[PDB]
Amino acid sequence: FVEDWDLVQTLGEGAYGEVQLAVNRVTEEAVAVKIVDNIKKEICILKMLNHENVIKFYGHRREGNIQYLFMELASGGSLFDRIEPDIGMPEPDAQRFFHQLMAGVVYLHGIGITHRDIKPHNLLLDERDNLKIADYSLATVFRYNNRERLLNKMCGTLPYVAPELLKRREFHAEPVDVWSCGIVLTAMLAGELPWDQPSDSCQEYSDWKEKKTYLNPWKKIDSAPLALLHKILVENPSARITIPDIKKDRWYNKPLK
Ligand SMILES: C[C@@H]1CCCN1c1c(C#N)c2c(N)ncnc2n1C
């Protein structure tokens, strides 16, 4: 369906466009291809990406209106599909995925890139269940020539967004991504999202700020990972734990099955 590649089946759809499995008729190599028709930007960011926990970019092709973004195939599918509703997954699997997600986010932050839509749909698995951060549709530069710029665009997915993104005119990129990593960890350990959005008017958010951890999803989570979620899901982004400090957390470093 494109040059040497056949488009076998749909892998899913994001905001704009669709992702297909592409098998090479000759080589039998299978990749993923995103079919689109802002996009100059995504391509530019995709070409920066070189890390084991980030989806690799292979190259692009415009054929009329349609753009084709060839990227690493994650044959394990999404983290979303490993989260059992109302249960989550075994704590050692969740810890391993969390370690990989941090590795990925440190890498992105280190090249001055914020993902801005971290959630289990955008977290993919290779054939060895290695986590890959995928979909650079909303990704943006927050650091250039060693100068940070504050963000102002509201974007992402409400249950995953940090509260400052609803309250502040401008905010730091990195603590928004840390927050969404904490919602992902909650989802992995409890198989449910704690609130529709982190606003004053959201009773489940108020409950958390009042430390009612006898409620779900918190009552399903062991005390060690929950102590970490206490440091991540902190309303003031300048008091929120940073990744260097996540890497010193007792649960983060706890040996597990
Ligand atoms: C993450 C997006 C969102 C829509 C579905 N997606 C994707 C990919 C991307 N990109 C992707 C990929 N590279 N390998 C395998 N499966 C993929 N799926 C489901």
From Swiss-Prot:
Gene Ontology biological process: apoptotic process; apoptotic process involved in development; cellular response to mechanical stimulus; chromatin remodeling; DNA damage checkpoint signaling; DNA damage response; DNA repair; DNA replication
MF (Gene Ontology): ATP binding; histone H3T11 kinase activity; protein domain specific binding; protein kinase activity; protein serine kinase activity; protein serine/threonine kinase activity
Region of interest (Interaction with CLSPN), residue spans: 1-252
Catalytic center residues: 117
Known partners and oligomeric status: Interacts (phosphorylated by ATR) with RAD51. Interacts with and phosphorylates CLSPN, an adapter protein that regulates the ATR-dependent phosphorylation of CHEK1. Interacts with BRCA1. Interacts with and phosphorylates CDC25A, CDC25B and CDC25C. Interacts with FBXO6, which regulates CHEK1. Interacts with PPM1D, which regulates CHEK1 through dephosphorylation. Interacts with TIMELESS; DNA damage-dependent. Interacts with FEM1B; activates CHEK1 in response to stress. Interacts with TLK1. Interacts with XPO1 and YWHAZ. Interacts with CDK5RAP3; antagonizes CHEK1.
Shown stretch of the complete protein: 5 to 270 of 476
Task performed by this protein: Serine/threonine-protein kinase which is required for checkpoint-mediated cell cycle arrest and activation of DNA repair in response to the presence of DNA damage or unreplicated DNA. May also negatively regulate cell cycle progression during unperturbed cell cycles. This regulation is achieved by a number of mechanisms that together help to preserve the integrity of the genome. Recognizes the substrate consensus sequence [R-X-X-S/T]. Binds to and phosphorylates CDC25A, CDC25B and CDC25C.
Chemical reaction(s) catalysed: L-seryl-[protein] + ATP = O-phospho-L-seryl-[protein] + ADP + H(+); L-threonyl-[protein] + ATP = O-phospho-L-threonyl-[protein] + ADP + H(+)
Cross-link position per record: Glycyl lysine isopeptide (Lys-Gly) (interchain with G-Cter in ubiquitin): 119
Linked pathology: Oocyte/zygote/embryo maturation arrest 21: An autosomal dominant, female infertility disorder characterized by zygote development arrest due to failure of pronuclei fusion.
Entry similarity comment: Belongs to the protein kinase superfamily. CAMK Ser/Thr protein kinase family. NIM1 subfamily.
A single cellular component GO annotation: extracellular space
Organism from which the protein derives: Homo sapiens
UniProt effect for mutating residue 117 to A: Abolishes kinase activity
UniProt modification remark: Phosphorylated by ATR in a RAD17-dependent manner in response to ultraviolet irradiation and inhibition of DNA replication. Phosphorylated by ATM in response to ionizing irradiation.
Domain notes: The autoinhibitory region (AIR) inhibits the activity of the kinase domain.
Protein name: Serine/threonine-protein kinase Chk1
Inhibition and activation profile: Activated through phosphorylation predominantly by ATR but also by ATM in response to DNA damage or inhibition of DNA replication. Activation is modulated by several mediators including CLSPN, BRCA1 and FEM1B. Proteolytic cleavage at the C-terminus by SPRTN during normal DNA replication activates the protein kinase activity.
Keyword Nuclease: no
